[PDB]
Structure formats: structure tokens, C-alpha cells
Amino acid sequence: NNTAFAAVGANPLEAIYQGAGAADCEFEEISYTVYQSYLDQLPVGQNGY
Amino acid sequence: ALINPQFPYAGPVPIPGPAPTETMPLLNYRVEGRIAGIQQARQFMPFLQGPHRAVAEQTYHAIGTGIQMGQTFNQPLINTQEG
């Protein structure tokens, strides 16, 4: 709530929303899902991969 | 190149040039690099090395069994022609 909402006249650099209603804005929730991208199988021979 | 007399092309860029900097130096890089994480001997795949059948042949097992049994009816006797 501290970084996401900027009051009128405040620096909006790190904020998501700015406006006269900022002081009363609140996140209800945040969710994240991390997906990892990689290469599998890799063929192995007499020197390793 | 064309040179034209009497307006000749200066015979050089001369000594009035403005040396702008001494920043000419590339500092050699000195470094030690180590990529040493424990390696485990195995990887999992869905399938590696298989040469899957596109069609199989028809395949079978075999059996026989029984005995030699029979009910018979014969042709009647006939007059012999010749001989």
C-alpha cells in the first residue's frame, strides 16, 4: 500500500495508481506464479554433456 | 582523388589538430572463473533410444490335439468288366 498509491503532487515513479483517492486505496491481494524455462535431456557422451 | 592547381588539397591534416583525450586505455581484465556445482549422473526423459513399431506383424501360438476316429459307409460291390 505504501509504494503502489501516490497522492496528487507526490512522485509517481514507483506507484501503480495516483489520484485524490490514494490515501484510501488498498491491495486486497496479490498472487504470483513462477514458471521456469529450461533445457532438458540433454545428451550425455564420454565427456559428460 | 583529384588534386587541382592552383587550389591544391592541403598536403596533410597538420599540427593544429586538437588532441581531445588521453583515454586510450583498455585496462586488461584479470579474472578467476569457477563453474562447480555437484553433477548427478542421470536425467529423466519420456523416452530416449526407442525405435517404436509403426505396425507389428501378426503373431500367434499353436495347438493341436486329438485322435483318429471315424464312422464310414462304402460303395457296393460291382461286376468286374474285363481282365
Curated annotation (Swiss-Prot), chain A:
Location of this chain's protein in the cell: Virion
S-S bridge residues: none
Assembly information from the UniProt record: Homotrimer.
Role played: Major capsid protein self-assembles to form an icosahedral capsid with a pseudo T=25 symmetry, about 66 nm in diameter, and consisting of 240 capsid proteins trimers. The capsid encapsulates an inner membrane and the genomic dsDNA genome. The major coat protein P3 and two assembly factors (P10 and P17) are needed during the assembly of the virus particle inside the host cell, when the capsid protein multimers are capable of enclosing the host-derived membrane, containing the virus-encoded membrane-associated proteins.
Protein name: Major capsid protein P3
Organism: Enterobacteria phage PRD1
Upper classification of the organism: Viruses, Varidnaviria, Bamfordvirae, Preplasmiviricota, Tectiliviricetes
Included stretch of the parent chain: 199 to 247 of 395
Curated annotation (Swiss-Prot), chain B:
Pfam families, alphabetized: Tecti-min-caps (PF09300)
InterPro entries assigned: Tecti-min-caps
Keyword Transmembrane assigned: no
Subcellular location, record wording: Virion
One BP term from GO: viral capsid assembly
Gene Ontology CC terms, in alphabetical order: viral capsid
Main location: virion
Keywords annotated in UniProt: Capsid protein, Virion
Keyword check for Ribonucleoprotein: no
Lineage top rank: taxon: Viruses
Summary of the function given for this chain in its UniProt record: Minor capsid protein essential for stable capsid assembly of complete particles.
Quaternary assembly: Dimer.
Protein name: Minor capsid protein P30
